[PDB]
Structures are given as C-alpha cells and as structure tokens.
Design a protein around this ligand. Structure first.
Ligand SMILES: [Ca+2]
Ligand SMILES: [Ca+2]
Lengths: 644, 637
C-alpha cells in the first residue's frame, strides 16, 4: 500500500527511518560491522524502521519532564504523533556504541558526519496533511485563519513559534500599513498647495538653479528642473509622511515588543513550553572596506550604462539598475559568507548543539548585517558629505573623489534600495523556496528511478524529498530579521513598507507553510520557549532603530531644515514673511559656490568674512537636528518605560 | 542575675518577649496565650521540637553541609521563627471575628511591646572590634553581622562596604584632579586673568536684580574664581567621564558580589492627591527660593568672605533647615495618605511606601539642586527682560562662570551637613531618651536589673527599620553620582563619612535599639530598580552639568575653533583672551553672561554664531558621552 504508515504486521505506526548500505574498497567492512552491532543494543535496499512502543516511550519519557495531555499535570496525568520523532531522536542520541579500545560514540551525530549512514528522518502520511494543505498551504487561502495550535501540534514547537511570530507580525503591520497609506494619500494629494515639490517642478523657482557637476568629469552643469519627476513624488516621503510617520514607527516598535512578550506569556500559559580580533573581526573589517569595492563596481557600471542610453529619469533608471546589480553581488557574497562562516566556525572547538548554534547565530547574523545594511548605512549617513572651500572632497585617502547627493537630502536612492532589496529579495527567496524543491524532486524522480510499480512506499517518497538539516528554521529567522530591520531601521521613507511586507508575509505564511507540508521531510518537533538567540537581537535592533530613525529624519530627510525654515527663517527674523510659511524654501537654503554653481550644503557665500565655512543657518539646523534626536530618543525610551 | 537570658530552671534561652471596656481586651488576651502553649514580661521560648515543626513552611537551608533543613550536617533565627509562629497562629472566636498575629493587636493597644533580647560574648567583642571609636579602620566580620543581626542588616552593611573600600578609588581620583586643578592654575589663563585686574577686572557688570544692586566688576570674582579653577579647569571632564564609567562599573560589580553572597548564604484618583502634592512641592520650590531671597536680601543690609560665599552658605543652611522641617511634614503626610488606601500585605505596603516616600524625598532634596544647575540663570533677551515667572517678580541670574560654586556649596552643605546631623540624632536621641526613661520612670534599682527590663527601656526599632537608612544612603548616592562634576572630594567627604557611619549605625545597632528579627533577604530590595534609574538619569544629568552649567565646553570651543586664524588672532590651541571674548555686551538704552549679538548686529540681541556653535558642541558632547557610556555598560553587561 502506497499509504502505509505502519509495519508489515500493522497496528504499529512508524516513527523513524534510517538508511545505510555497507555491503560493498577494503575499508567498507569496517563500517559494515560498526553499524552491524550498532542496531543490536537499540533493539527493544531496506529502510531501517524505528518504532517506540508504549512500554518504551513510557520508560524513556522519565528522563525529560514533558506535560502529557481538559487539564495537564507535571509528568503524570490522564486525559500526539509529533513527539514520537523527538523521543526516538533522544533515544538515539543517548544510547551509545560500546567498544573495547576506548573509542565511544553516542548518537549518529558523528556517525552520519563520517559517512556510515545515508539518511535519517521521520515520515508522515499522504488526514491532517490534506486538511492542512487546503487552507494553509496553497496561496488561495490568503484570508483564511491559520490553526496555530494545529501547527504546534503537528510540525513542532519551533515551527509553531516561527509561524505565530509571523502570524502576530502581519496581525499588527496592517495598522502600520494603513498609517503608511494615510501618509501616502497626504503626500500625493498635497503636492500643490505646500510650496514644496511644486517649486522644484515650477521652471521659475526650482528650474533656474544651475548646479555644478557632482564628480570630477563627464557630468555637466545640470539644473534642478530635471528633479521634478522625482521631486513631485518626493513629498510623499516628505512632509507629514516623515515626522509623525517615523515617530509612530518608533512608538510602534517599542510597544509591540512588549505586546508580544504578553503574547509569549499567553503561549506559555497555553502549552507546556518548559585570536578573536584576527580572522573573525578581520573579515568584518574587510567587508567594511569591501563596500568601497562594491560602490566602485557600481560606478564602473552606471558610467558605461549612461553612455549606452514612463518618464525614466536618469536618477530613477540608473538607481534601479545599480540596486539590482548590487543586490546580485550581495546574493553572491552572501553565498560566500554562507561558506566561510561555516568553514571558520567548525575550526574552533565548540560546545554542544545549543552553544554551537548560538555562536553560529552571533557570527552569521553580524555577517548578514554588514552584508546588507552596510550599503544602506553608507547611503543614509555618510554618502553625500565633505565639500569644502575649493569643492575638495575627502578623496578617501586616494585620488578618487566621493559621490554627492541631490538637493533633497538624498532619500529616493535609499527608498529605492529598500524597495529593491527587501522587495526584490521577497520575490527571490520565495522563488527559490518554491522552485528548488520542485526541480530537485523532478531530477531525482526522472534520473534515479523511472516508471515505478504504481505503489510507491511512503519511506521511498520521503527519501526522495529534500532534507531539512539541523539549521532548519535558522535561515527563516535570518531572512525575517532582515525584513524586520528593513521595516524598522529605515522606515521614514517608503510609508508602504509594512504593506509591501504585509501581503508578502501573507504569501510567505502560506509558502513556507506549503513547503513545510509537501516539499521537505518532516522535522523532529523540538521544544522551545521563545524564538531564542534572536530576541536580544530584536531588542538591540529596536534600540538602534530609534537612534537610526532619528538620524534618518535629521541628517538625511531634509525635514528638519524645512521646519526650521518656516519657524525661524521665514518669520521677520531671518526672513520677510508674516507667519509660519514655507515659501521660498528651495532658493533660500542652497548655498552658492564660486568656481574660481549652487551646491547642497549650507555654507557662507563667497565673500563672507568666514567664506565657505558654515553659516548661521547650518549651525541652527544642526542644533535643531541634535535637539530633535535627543528629544525623540528621550521621549521614545520614556514611552517604553511607561509601557515596560 | 542581671545577665540572665534563661528561666529559673536555666539552660533554656529566651527567644522573645511580649508585654468596662478593659475587661474585653483582658479576656481577649487571657485566651490568646492559651493556644500558643506547646506588668508581666511574657517570655516566649521556642524549644527544638516547635522550631522543627513550624520551620518547615519557611524553607531554610542551614547545617558546613548546606543541603536542606532535614539534614544532619543559630540564636538569630529563633526570633524570626517565633514571629512567624505568632503571625500564623490566629485567635478563634464564635462571632466571625478572627485575628492572626499581633499586627492588628498592638495597633488597637491590647499589648505594650514585643521584641527579642540579646546578650549583655558575641556582643562585647562586636562592640569592641566593630562598634567602638578605637576600632574604626579594623576590618568588618560581615559573617559576624549576618549570623547575629540578620540578612537585612548584613546586606545594608555590605552594600555600605563598597562605599568605604572601592569608593576610595573615586576619592583618590577626585584628589588627583583636585591637585591638578590647583597646580596648573597660573599657566592656563583661566582664573588668572579673572584675578588679574588689568583684563579681568575692567569688565563692569550690570545688576542682576531689579533694584538695590549696583554695577559690579569681575575683579571681585577673583577670590571665588581662583578656587573655581580646581572645580572646572580640566579635571571636570575626565572626572565626570570616569564617574559615569565607575557607576556603570560597580553596578554590575556589586551584582557579581550579590551572586557571590548568594553562593555563600541560602537567601531562599491617582493623579489627584498623590501627584497633586508632588506638583504642589514642585510649585513650593518657588516659595523656598522666595524665602531664601528674602533672607539674604536683609542679611546683606545687616578670610576673603566674599558676599557670594557667605551668602551661598547662609542661604544653603536656611534652605537645609526648611528642607528638614518639610521632610518631617512629608514623613507625616506620606504615612497619613498611604494608610488611607487599602493596601496588600506588608511587602506590597512597604513597596508602595517606598515608591511614595522616595519620590517625596527626591523632590524634597534634588529639586533645589536641579533648579540651580539647569534652569536658574537663563532667560535674558532684548531689553534684559526675564520671564518674570508669570508675575511681577523677576528671575535670578548667575555669574560669568557657569554658576557652579552655588551648586557645589549646596552639595557640601546638604550631603555634608546632613552627614553630620543625621549621625547627631542617631547617636544622641537614644542617649537622651534612655536617660529620660531611666531618670523619670524608675530610679535607684537594687543593683540587679533584669535583661528584659533594660531591653524594654531601650528604644524600639519598628517595622520601618532599615527603610530610613536606605533612604538616606540612596540620597547620598544620588548626590555623589548625579551632581559629581564639581567638588571632586565628594566621595572622600563621603568616604570618612561612611567609615564613621559604618561604625555609628553599627554602634547604634549593638547598644541603643532593641534586637530586630533576622529577616530573610537576598538583596537590598525595591531599591535596585531605583539605583538603575538613578544611574541612567545620572549619565544624562552629568552630561547636562558639564554642558549647560559648567562652562567647560565653551572653554574647549574657544581654544579649538576661536583661537585659530578664523574667529581669532592666534596661532595654536591657546586659552588666551577667553573671558573678554565670550561675554556679550548689553546696552542699557554692561556685559552680561549669555552669548548674544552686540547692540547693532543686524540680528541685535538675537543669538550669535558663538552661542549656536557652543550649543551644537554641548548637544554633540551630551550625545557622544551618553552613547559611549551605554556602549561601555553594554560591554560590561
Ligand atoms: Ca522563508
Ligand atoms: Ca544611618
């Protein structure tokens, strides 16, 4: 029978499979009779079946305290196919191989690494798999609520916590999405009567500003008018779409953390749930330097691409193409890091599985942080600075100049990077997660055995399925923490970032689910009280996110400069208006340059006693930026103090 | 037998002592002692069997071999066990009137007193080598305190330990910067040009008050500016940075010590009324400053005793007296409002009492210091018009030094004067009241005084025993970490203080007060969150003290970016010409302290580039120092 969950005699559900074949140079007999006696003490091509009867599960459940299934009691009570796999795995790990020459091994952790065995896994049916396939696997059930209790009871506590965290995620990124939509409509509608994003488009005030080339050569004296196509759509990320949006984002990120702490407490109430500087930091410093190589490649790309060539402005198509190239390079370099972190972690002598995975987290998460967010931090914080008296950039300790931004507090490049990285990867990781299992399963089914007997045993089909590995949910937490960082660190621009995430996760909460019910082999239902080794990382990300949001609003949003302009530079002090009006902002902010243009920085005109040194406007604006940072951060940690 | 801790039979030590409407409580107390059986001095004793029987509920692990109570491998714990037995056993009636313990019994007034008794031994040696003026510097046997006076007193004297041993490092760093500020005093152009009449005495000021104040000169500042040098020349920066690192160090260092002692020992409507009085005292600090002004204004009409030294001392003493009187009033009112609300058990009641009285004392003490440090000498504009505080009364203005001598004088007189006065009461009140009792109740005994009689004549300690000591020491901690930029000797002033206090309290805990029940405690309790909040606020307030009220960042700015060919006619990083080129001119139709444009700049009396540069430096300094400090404590923890 193809749907055989039992033995030949029947009435005995299979709990595990392990496969090996050492019948056939010279050394083969050694592992042959190593594994020949290994199964002997475990007793209470052929697929070695492992089952745990009542008297075995009862006698080996005494070691670990697990609340059996009304109400529950500690270790003993009276009123689960999932826990059998974990019990069998624990039995395999505890029972060792006894010899007479002092070479003792326990479990197959070392056995499968050497190569004695081939594979080991539990198996499920073809029931709870179909009912979970219909409303939870296929993307048609977008709005259907998931049975997280069923997920916990079927695919283990770790997967249940991962999905509940994702279920809780879009449960309250919909409010962030609707706030983003409100800011979206405010920015889009109020593109006319605000003297911003209309001055730039108007050829009389924001069109007569003759800039000067940003780089050394092969750039002409452009005009601000060309900014129109990207300035009219800039206000959506500016104005009220920036200040209250990011303040609400900070309050939200500080509050739902504690809200999900309460959710975790509720879950615990429901379920039981009871030399360093070198090499390691050397490679991180090397990639901190290698972002320079990445941007050098990016320039070497678009310099040629500009000569090669829906209102596709140069700074839109160029930025999109550059972001795609950088994303491809980031994926390749992430593959390189996936190799090197593993190759350096096993070099050190680690502790058991828990500490090994904790160290692997502490290394790979930082590797991915510096791999992904380095470019975003470069563009956001220290990209378009350092222009002085003769217009001399820092030159980066060489003969190569630095790149300069646009008169908007360059954020369109940042939001394009966000959209193409966290949005492009959203497509691409799902593409691999859906298609790689199909293509490899088809390769196995069309290259190993073809034309079966029309009755395929369950173990054979499961063996043909892809393994899940010990780093099962590590990669999902990694990608989701990357999404979390992109949706909380840089959420000042792109108000629709959670919404772009929202539907994303609604697909993922199915797609992953789908790949967890049809593609990968069933995983042992491990028990965990939380996400683990990521929650402190989440707290650190939130603490850094408050500061980085303040720095995004101040140093690279050009919102504080306009607030300052219509509060203190528009009034009769420093100005000629009557009340808080934003008129004349663009002309009365940019500073003049003498070639012997008008660049973006705030500096004195050529002939002030302090020429090309910062003026009163710059110092006022930077004092306002620092005050805004201090006030917002203090208010945010005060708010989280009230919350927790 | 005056030294008799046993009954007539002997070999049975006393473990505790307790001593038409009248008939009601007479009958209630007559049957109360009946179920407890296993002026009269009821000697409650606990044999071994009752100790084992009713010590099982409160799990205590004590042997050598610390495994569990029921093992086969302490005069202190008998009092606690007897107290627990008294509290658990209730009085049974047939009218639905059930009372357990004497917490309600002594409140009504059926009994008079209840206390354990100690020896006249382990108390004599502990008086000599630990509680005597001849043994001040001798090392503490903290075990001899833990097993004799209880976990609470032991934790109090161990937490006070590091204020005597490793507060010495802070004190010696303070001494080092104290001597550094006095040696490099002539060759810094600061506090020398001020004392030089040629360039620092020609700067005529203008009156700070509306009337009865003449146009003075900076020359008179000399006697207070020359000694100001040690407070802010260069020792303030490294001093406060080291203080922040030091506090964010010993917090976790004492966490480690707490873990070590855990290894050693077992240790098993709101907006109104409550916040209304706090906002009322926030307003009443205005009344306090009005009172101090009214005092020294008249005193002005009445060893280089400059007006701003004698005045700052006299007004500080008057404010300290008023603060003590108000603290008595708050001790009354917090108790009178806390019992109004229906509280939980004793632990939660004392937690609420902590949360109320600590805030009351915070606003009582640190409000004046925050007023002087942060928002005292500001708000001068175009015609020299102060904010007037929503009235016809002007505000008070500071001196061209980033007024800090007033702040350090307030610290020295408050945390130093109280350091004397609290010890004075703690030493003399027991003597005077014991003498009153011994010379007014019974005189001329028969030369044999029973132990219980002498103990009864001693003062009671109460349920709020160590609450006041934690309160005063947390006040000292706040004064030595919040405002530790000036007065580098503040730890050293504390140090000997603590070295005396760690005896004085010790002394008063072996001769004056009645023995206290050895309560079970694993930490100071309900104060560690307060200490963490104090440290987090302390980093920020130290940054604001260095920036907004130290006049140090302006001194960095002058010789970094104003003594260079832009903004200055110099050639290096030199402090020359700082005083003249910082204060801004005022036109009456003087030269005040704030940084504003001269009378005739297109933005007249609006702020110049100097103030905006200095405030940008201040904000950058605050941000950088705070970020570095929490990064450092992240590395530490
Ligand atoms: Ca995924
Ligand atoms: Ca004391």
């Amino acid at each position: 029978k193809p749907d055989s969950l039992f033995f030949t005699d029947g009435q005995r559900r299979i709990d595990f499979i392990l496969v090996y074949e050492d019948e056939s140079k010279g050394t083969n007999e050694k592992q042959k009779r190593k594994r020949q006696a290994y199964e002997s003490n475990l007793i209470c091509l052929v697929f070695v079946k492992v089952h745990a009867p009542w008297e075995v599960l009862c006698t080996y459940a005494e070691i670990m305290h697990i609340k059996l299934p009304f109400e529950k009691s500690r270790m003993n009570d009276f009123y689960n196919p999932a826990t059998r796999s974990r019990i069998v795995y624990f039995i395999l790990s505890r029972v060792k191989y006894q010899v007479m020459n002092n070479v003792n091994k326990f479990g197959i952790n070392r056995l499968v690494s050497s190569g004695i065995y081939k594979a080991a896994f539990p198996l499920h049916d073809c029931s709870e798999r179909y009912l979970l396939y219909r409303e939870w696997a296929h993307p048609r059930s977008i709005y259907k609520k998931q049975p997280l209790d069923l997920i916990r009871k079927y695919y283990g506590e770790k997967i249940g916590i991962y999905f509940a965290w994702l279920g809780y995620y879009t449960q309250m990124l919909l409010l962030a999405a609707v706030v983003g939509v409100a800011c979206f409509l405010y920015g889009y509608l109020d593109q006319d009567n605000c003297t911003w994003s209309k001055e730039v488009c108007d050829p009389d005030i924001g069109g007569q500003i003759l800039m000067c080339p940003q780089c050394d050569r092969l750039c002409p004296f452009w005009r601000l008018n060309i900014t129109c196509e990207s300035s009219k759509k800039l206000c959506i990320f500016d104005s009220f779409g920036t200040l209250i949006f990011a303040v609400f984002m900070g309050v939200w990120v500080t509050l739902f953390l504690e809200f999900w702490k309460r959710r975790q407490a509720e879950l615990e109430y429901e379920w039981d749930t009871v030399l360093c500087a070198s090499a390691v930091f050397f490679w991180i410093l090397l990639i901190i330097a290698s972002v320079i190589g990445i941007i050098v490649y990016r320039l070497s790309v678009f310099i040629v691409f500009s000569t090669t060539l829906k209102y596709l402005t140069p700074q839109m198509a160029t930025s999109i193409t550059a972001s795609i190239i950088s994303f491809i390079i980031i994926m390749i370099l992430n593959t390189i890091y996936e190799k090197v972190a593993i190759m350096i972690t096993n070099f050190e002598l680690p502790r058991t599985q828990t500490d090994y995975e904790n160290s692997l987290t502490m290394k790979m998460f930082l590797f991915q942080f510096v791999n992904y967010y380095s470019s975003c931090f470069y563009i956001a914080f220290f990209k378009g600075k350092f222009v002085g008296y003769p217009g001399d950039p820092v030159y980066l300790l060489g003969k190569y100049r630095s790149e300069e931004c646009d008169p908007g507090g360059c954020l369109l490049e940042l939001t394009t990077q966000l959209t193409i990285i966290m949005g492009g990867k959203a497509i691409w990781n799902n593409i691999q997660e859906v298609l790689l299992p199909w293509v490899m399963n088809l390769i196995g089914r069309y290259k190993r055995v073809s034309g079966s007997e029309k009755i395929t045993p369950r173990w054979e089909q499961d063996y043909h399925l892809q393994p899940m590995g010990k780093l099962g949910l590590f990669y999902e937490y990694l990608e989701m923490i990357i999404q979390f960082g992109f949706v909380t660190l840089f959420v000042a621009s792109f108000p629709l970032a959670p919404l772009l995430a929202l539907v994303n996760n609604i697909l993922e909460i199915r797609v992953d689910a789908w790949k967890l019910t049809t593609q990968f082999r069933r995983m042992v239902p491990e028990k965990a009280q939380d996400i683990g080794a990521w929650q402190p990382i989440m707290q650190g990300i939130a603490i850094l996110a408050v500061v980085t949001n303040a720095m995004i609003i101040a140093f690279t949003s050009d919102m504080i400069p306009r607030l300052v302009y219509y509060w203190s530079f528009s009034i009769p002090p420093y100005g000629d208006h009557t009340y808080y009006t934003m008129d004349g902002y663009i002309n009365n902010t940019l500073s003049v340059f003498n070639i012997t243009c008008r660049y973006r920085d705030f500096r004195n005109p050529p002939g002030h006693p302090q020429e090309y040194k910062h003026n009163i406007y710059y110092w006022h604006v930077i004092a306002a930026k620092l005050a805004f940072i201090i006030v917002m951060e203090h208010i945010i940690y005060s708010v989280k103090f009230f919350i927790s």
